[PDB]
Design a protein around this ligand. Structure first.
Ligand SMILES: NC(=O)c1cc([N+](=O)[O-])c(NCCN2CCNCC2)cc1NCc1cnc(N)nc1
Length: 293
């Protein structure tokens, strides 16, 4: 509209996203255009609810605009995402104190969302935004299940499966808060090793990469797994690997927490609230990151 002044095009989110300035307030925001034969009225209501979900580690949804039947989401603006920061820190690696601070903050954000019955469902480094003060915030939220499993964006883009929990890959129709803990565990491992934990290039390659590392799940470690929608008795049976080999040289406090975030059974997987109490965070601090904007 005329209330906004486009500053630049940020990219092609999971719709198009622009950095824009509000002429009235003068505030700089991120404007996402969501492209469809009437724009569901059940969604606009669900979205409108997220406007009240405020927390320091959650990107604020400032406004929802339906006018013109285009549907625009206005978000608070942050300059960089964790994916770019990790690439920039590839040579030296993000310092452990900062990795710990970020993980701690993200768990606080998840604990808040989960206590308000809000799930993210599509956590990935590109959806974690950071600023110069050392803060990190959860963004996007997959649009509150508005768009289920997006195979291609408005211009056909390859959906990342790297952070998908095993129960989703096995066809479970009801996601629980545990899917977000799994994704965050994968991100924690990636910050530590500087390599994606499970970089699959297809749904089955994703599932098999998980099995090759954590062992093919069975009824002992995951009661009910063999009855899941897409489970096949023909899956190969791989033995589990030790975490000392998976995320070296992370210490035992870190390995212990990661192991709990990656349990196969969603019911055994640690909650965000419980993870905040883990010994790994006894010495947590809030360092300032080296950001080049
Ligand atoms: N709230 C925001 O400031 C913000 C919002 C969105 N968004 O989507 O509304 C966004 N898009 C990222 C698109 N992806 C998410 C889905 N997986 C692929 C990556 C980026 C943002 N900021 C960080 C940033 C700023 N500037 C440049 N150039 N790059 C990044």
């Amino acid at each position: 509209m005329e209330n906004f002044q486009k500053v630049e095009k940020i990219g092609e989110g999971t719709g198009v996203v622009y950095k824009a300035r509000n002429k009235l307030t003068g505030e700089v925001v991120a404007l996402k255009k969501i492209r469809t034969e009437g724009v569901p009225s059940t969604a606009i209501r669900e979205i409108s609810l997220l406007k009240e979900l405020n927390h320091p580690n959650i990107v604020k949804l400032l406004d929802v605009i339906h006018t013109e039947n285009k549907l625009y989401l206005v978000f608070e603006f942050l300059h960089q995402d964790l994916k770019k920061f990790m690439d920039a820190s590839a040579l030296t690696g993000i310092p452990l104190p900062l990795i710990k601070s970020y993980l701690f903050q993200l768990l606080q954000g998840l604990a808040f969302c989960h206590s308000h019955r809000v799930l993210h469902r599509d956590l990935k480094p590109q959806n974690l935004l950071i600023n110069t003060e050392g803060a990190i915030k959860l963004a996007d939220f997959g649009l509150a299940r508005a768009f289920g499993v997006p195979v291609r964006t408005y211009t056909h883009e390859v959906v990342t499966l790297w952070y998908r929990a095993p129960e989703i890959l096995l066809g479970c129709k009801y996601y629980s808060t545990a899917v977000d803990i799994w994704s965050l565990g994968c991100i924690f491992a990636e910050m530590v090793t500087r390599r994606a934990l499970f970089p699959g290039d297809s749904e089955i390659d994703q599932l098999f990469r998980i099995f090759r590392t954590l062992g093919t799940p069975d009824e002992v470690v995951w009661p009910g797994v063999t009855s899941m929608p897409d489970y096949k008795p023909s899956f190969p049976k791989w033995a589990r690997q030790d975490f000392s080999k998976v995320v070296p040289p992370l210490d035992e406090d870190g390995r212990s927490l990661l192991s709990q975030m990656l349990h196969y059974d969603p019911n055994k997987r640690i909650s965000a609230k419980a993870a905040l109490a883990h010994p790994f965070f006894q010495d947590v601090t809030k360092p300032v990151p080296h950001l080049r904007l």
